[PDB]
Amino acid sequence: EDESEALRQARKDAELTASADSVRAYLKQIGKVALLNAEEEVELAKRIEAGLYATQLMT
């Protein structure tokens, strides 16, 4: 079913495929990062604000 080595390495092997079509390979790779919500967006925006502030301070 899903556990007991039937589906985990199944997913790993299915993902680890040749993907001859270039668009297919790109869509396979893009299916790796989870989507984001508003709180994550504002938190990452705060992190980027801190990063650019630190870059300005370095300058």
């Binding site: 079913e1 039937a6 199944a10 790993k12 299915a14 495929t17 297919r24 390979a25 299916g31």
Partner: protein, 1111 residues
């Protein structure tokens, strides 16, 4: 007969035909009627499948609707496809180059399931091209004809194969549905099976049946007798429905991790969903017949079902066991056998309806995509069907289909027969078909099912041999796409008049009889053994009581182009093939005399070709003129047929129409009123009746050459009016405007005499190669004015002449008088293309006489060019003194096996001189079966001969015996056909008699005037400096590598280098050679070809360091 104006054509036919030939255009008209859904077709299906009367457009609209959004609370549907009157009648759309078309209207229902509101908007679908009465479309003025296509009908196809290793038999299947993914079930080299899904070579049936919600108990219950599938299920090695689903996901959608539900829905969306796998309505019924699934149920759910898959498994596995009959649980029993792919029960025919349906389906798919995109981006209740609809893709798709598609081609019309045969022709190349390179040897062969459906003789001799053919004369297209032919059914040796129609597959389960059988009028064949066609196409003897079908008539297996060949049965198949093909390319002469010896098919072929005026309604003729005929019908009103005079055909021939009625005659509905280009008294006439001697004369008729007398040239017996058109357009340009004016720079006056001040040639003025036609002057802009030009103008006072005279001139090698000028312009408020503002087209015609090199041929396969036209003195003449017109060689007819035309020659002489059979002491033995009214024939009497039931040898010999003379007492020909004839060169009589008689010859459209070409220094191509090729361009013959082989073998090196470098390529070499030969100087040393430098640069651009080293 049965034609009101039919000339009296006596016939040698023995038996009668129970039915007349159907309207040979019925495969184009009826299909378009189905497409539109006209009331004629509406009532046609009322007794031929009224279970679901629906048109092609109605079917597509119903399939498309309803279309909704992701939420399902808002949707749109289509209904009521209503047409409209055509914008303009045919001739004007042929004049100003507009498509013969009418607006299309449909009703759109907007539904909003959230609250519910109705919006019935009558949207303008577009401009749908229509089909004319002749079955030809008009696109941009041109007349185009679409042809039906032969493809493999979607369904199930089992087949057998030998491994050639241990001689084990293997059985494979290919369920090939349109717009879907293939499944290939077979028995592998080893014992197990192969279940290839969409080209993936793994996973025997174990995972598939398991993936259908089953488990091992079901597959072991269904299959306990099939040890092959028992071994396979034992070799499952997988337990678990989800395990099988993920294993399928491996080899159906790799690259994405599988989940519990993804594979289960993926299988349904791949096979059992009618959006990604929909075998057409033909495919579902083909599967049902092949498997006996449903035998009395309406057609619905075009998508493939699971019981279909299980029945396919059972059928295949039982076939591997060698079983004969399979009975599916829940269905009738079906015999188990391999399916042939060329049998006409598996090859359908996509007529015009199906092709236009497919293009409309693509257009509606784009429509559904765009409307699905748009229905969500706009807020509810602010959206209307008009803004949901953007009709652009539909008209784009129809324009894509009608133009720049190889299945809807330019009409081949240089005589009525070519037009008739271009339609009702079956092709096999194109979208969904097989290319000639893709075509094997098996497909080109004649299948036993071709009989009565597709003619086995009519097919082009070129590379396309066998790929494209012509429809039979009695053939019918079922409302289902399969082809079908009529046949009378005999019961217990009693022949019935009831005509029933059978397809290719329905013929196997019956036994059809011979066409010309010894019928006694009581239905009983006098001998028990009769030639019959068995199930597998085998011919054999069989007693009479068990046969159940017979051919409706002879010439049922043959088309309309081959049914016009007299004495067909006496000719080899190859020569009959070529004769049928040359019948298509005869030219329309200026008189078109009817043939003496022919077949009854000529009248019907001429009548229904559509180019002869036929009185639709009976009545007296009010008045007759060359331009028009006014006919007064019985019910007061009148009708004026406007005759078409001197119209250029698509191949530049003549299409005059001469009325053949008087000012006070009565004409019945259906009678021929006026004759077309190649018709006499409403019957086909593609040639002339010429007296023939078959002796080989002094080598001028050597190797198929033909010699003619000057009488044909002087009496205009073989001369054709040929018309060409020359378009030329003045268009806007950054330099300004190009003017159609007489202000033509640096021209004389003797060549300006025949132009009007408007700037074009006077109507009725003679031109020739090089003469100016239209004076169009373009602003030259600027260039390097040579100093020598300045000294030139300083010597004479010539103006700069600031404009370039790129006027239109008659191209090389033609002449003749001008027929008409048509001019269009923007200030004439015309629909000119955006960019051009004048467009003038001039028609020039010349009465092309017959000369050396013109190809003349009979309709029996004999061909040849005119070796010479020698004067009337030097012609062998009979004792009466009439010179022979055409002499052909005798060394071709016995070797090439076309003796039929010798019989035609003798029958023609009998028909010309007239005959009478002495019925004093009873009728002679040979004339006992000869019909009455054929024992007497006046001079120049026309006869007829059906192709397979015609005049026999004994009857023709008896006719030759009594051949009463015309004016003097002189039986020129003896009983054996030969006749004495006097030499016109030396004067003494020839030692031995030779055969003479009247033969029907035709001039082919391969005249030498359009076939002679030569050039000294013309233009050259861009990339490589080689001269171009063709007749439109100045050309230049291709000196290929095969001729390079010959020149190298000769040992001639200087000639080869000359032909390569300076004569073709070396630019400086070309100009230097021309200067040297003009200057009378020695031709210089050839240089280096430019194409080699082009190759060197090209190879360098491919990252290949190529340098040529001096040392």
């Amino acid at each position: 007969n049965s034609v009101p104006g039919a000339p009296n054509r006596v016939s040698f036919a023995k038996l009668r035909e129970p039915l007349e030939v159907p309207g040979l255009l019925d495969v184009q008209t009826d299909s378009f009627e189905w497409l539109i859904g006209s009331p004629r077709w509406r009532e046609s299906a009322a007794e031929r499948g009224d279970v679901n009367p629906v048109g092609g457009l109605e079917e597509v609209l119903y399939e498309l609707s309803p279309i909704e959004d992701f939420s399902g609370s808002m949707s749109l549907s289509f209904s009521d496809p209503r047409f409209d009157d055509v914008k303009a009648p045919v001739d004007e759309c042929k004049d100003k180059d507009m498509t013969y078309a009418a607006p299309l209207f449909v009703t759109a229902e907007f539904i909003n399931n959230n609250t519910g509101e109705i919006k019935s908007q009558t949207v303008f679908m577009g401009d749908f091209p229509m089909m004319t009465e002749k079955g030809t479309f008009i696109i941009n003025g041109t007349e185009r004809v679409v042809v039906s296509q032969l493809v493999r009908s979607p369904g199930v196809y089992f087949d057998e194969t030998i491994d050639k290793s241990t001689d084990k038999t293997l059985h494979s299947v290919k369920v090939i549905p349109s717009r879907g993914a293939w499944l290939e079930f077979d028995v592998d080299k080893r014992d197990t099976v192969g279940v290839r899904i969409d080209r993936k070579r793994r996973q025997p049936v174990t995972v598939l049946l398991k993936a259908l919600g089953w488990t091992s108990e079901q597959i072991v219950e269904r299959f306990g007798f099939s040890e092959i599938m028992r071994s396979t299920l034992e070799k499952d090695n997988t337990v678990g429905t989800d395990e099988a689903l993920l294993d399928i996901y491996r080899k159906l959608r790799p690259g994405e991790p599988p989940t519990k539900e993804s594979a289960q829905t993926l299988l349904e969306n791949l096979f059992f969903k009618e959006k990604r796998y929909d075998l057409a309505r033909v495919g579902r019924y083909k599967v049902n017949k092949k498997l006996g699934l449903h035998v009395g149920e309406p057609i619905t759910s075009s998508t493939l079902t699971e019981e279909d898959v299980v029945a396919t498994i059972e059928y295949l596995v039982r076939l591997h066991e060698g079983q004969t009959t399979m009975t599916v649980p829940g269905g009738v029993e079906v015999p188990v056998e391999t399916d042939d792919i060329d049998h006409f029960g598996n090859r359908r025919l996509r007529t015009v309806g199906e092709l236009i349906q497919n293009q409309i389906r693509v257009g509606m798919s784009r429509m559904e995509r765009v409307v699905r995109e748009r229905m969500t981006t706009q807020d509810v209740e602010a959206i209307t069907p008009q803004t949901l609809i953007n009709i652009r893709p539909v008209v784009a798709a129809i324009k894509e289909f009608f133009g720049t598609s190889q299945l809807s081609q330019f009409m081949d019309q240089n005589n009525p027969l070519s037009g008739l045969t271009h339609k009702r022709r079956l092709s096999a190349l194109g979208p969904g078909g097989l290319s000639r390179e893709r075509a094997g040897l098996e497909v080109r062969d004649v299948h036993p099912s071709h009989y009565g459906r597709m003619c086995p003789i009519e097919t082009p001799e070129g590379p396309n041999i066998g790929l494209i053919g012509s429809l039979s004369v009695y053939a019918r297209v079922n409302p289902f796409g399969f082809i079908e032919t009529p046949y009378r059914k005999v019961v217990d040796g009693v022949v019935s008049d009831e005509i029933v129609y059978l397809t290719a597959d329905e013929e196997d389960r019956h036994v059809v009889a011979q066409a010309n059988s010894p019928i006694d009028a009581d239905g009983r064949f006098v001998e028990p053994r009769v030639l019959v066609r068995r199930k597998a196409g085998e011919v054999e003897y069989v007693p009479s009581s068990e046969v159940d079908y017979m051919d409706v008539s002879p010439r049922q297996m043959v088309s309309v182009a081959t049914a016009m060949i007299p004495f067909l049965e006496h000719d080899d198949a190859n020569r009959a093939l070529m004769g049928a093909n040359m019948q298509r390319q005869a030219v329309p002469l200026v008189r078109s005399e009817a043939p003496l010896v022919g077949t009854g098919m000529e009248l019907r072929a001429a009548i229904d070709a559509g180019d002869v005026v036929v009185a639709e309604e009976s009545g007296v003729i009010e008045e007759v003129s060359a331009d028009y005929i006014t006919v007064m019908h019985d019910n007061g009103t009148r009708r004026t047929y406007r005759m078409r005079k001197f119209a250029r055909s698509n191949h530049g021939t003549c299409a005059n129409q001469c009325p053949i009625v008087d000012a006070g005659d009565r004409v019945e509905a259906g009678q021929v009123i006026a004759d077309g280009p190649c018709t006499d008294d409403g019957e086909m006439a593609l040639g002339k009746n010429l007296l023939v001697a078959i002796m080989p004369w002094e080598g001028h008729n050597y190797e198929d050459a033909i010699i003619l007398s000057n009488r044909l040239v002087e009496e205009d017996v073989l001369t054709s009016i040929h018309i060409e058109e020359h378009e030329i357009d003045a268009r806007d340009t950054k330099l300004g405007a190009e003017e159609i004016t007489r202000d033509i720079p640096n021209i004389s006056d003797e060549v300006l005499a025949d132009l009007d001040e408007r700037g074009i040639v006077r109507i009725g003025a003679e031109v020739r190669d090089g003469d100016i036609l239209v004076g169009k002057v373009t602003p030259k802009g600027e260039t390097e004015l040579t100093p020598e030009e300045r000294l030139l103008r300083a010597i004479f006072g010539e103006k700069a002449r600031e404009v370039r005279d790129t006027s239109l001139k008659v191209p090389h090698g033609e002449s003749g008088k001008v027929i008409g000028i048509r001019v269009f312009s923007r200030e004439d408020e015309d629909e000119l293309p955006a960019g051009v503002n004048e467009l003038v087209r001039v028609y020039v015609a010349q009465k092309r006489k017959i000369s050396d090199g013109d190809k003349l041929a009979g309709r029996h396969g004999n061909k040849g060019v005119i070796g010479k036209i020698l004067p009337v003195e030097d012609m062998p003449f009979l004792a009466d003194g009439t010179p022979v017109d055409i002499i052909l060689n005798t060394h071709g007819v016995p070797r090439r096996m076309n003796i039929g035309q010798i019989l035609e020659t003798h029958l023609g002489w009998c028909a010309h001189s007239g005959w009478k059979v002495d019925a004093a002491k009873g009728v002679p033995d040979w004339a006992a079966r000869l019909p009455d009214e054929l024992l007497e024939a006046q001079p120049n009497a026309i006869v007829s001969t059906p192709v397979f039931d015609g005049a026999q040898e004994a009857e023709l010999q008896g006719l030759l015996s009594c051949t009463l003379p015309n004016r003097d007492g002189d039986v020129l020909v003896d009983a054996d056909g030969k006749a004495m004839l006097f030499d016109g060169r030396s004067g003494e009589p020839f030692p031995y008699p030779v055969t003479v008689g009247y033969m029907y010859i035709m001039k082919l459209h391969h005249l030498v005037d359009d076939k002679i070409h030569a050039r000294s220094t013309g233009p050259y191509s861009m990339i490589t400096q080689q001269p171009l090729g063709g007749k439109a361009q100045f050309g230049g013959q291709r000196f290929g590598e095969m001729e390079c082989w010959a020149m190298q073998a000769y040992g001639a090196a200087y000639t080869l280098q000359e032909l390569l470098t300076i004569k073709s390529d070396d630019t400086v070499g070309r100009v230097k050679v021309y200067e040297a030969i003009v200057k009378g100087e020695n031709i210089p040393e050839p240089g280096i070809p430019e194409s080699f430098k082009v190759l060197l640069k090209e190879l360098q651009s491919l990252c290949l360091n190529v340098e040529v080293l001096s040392s």
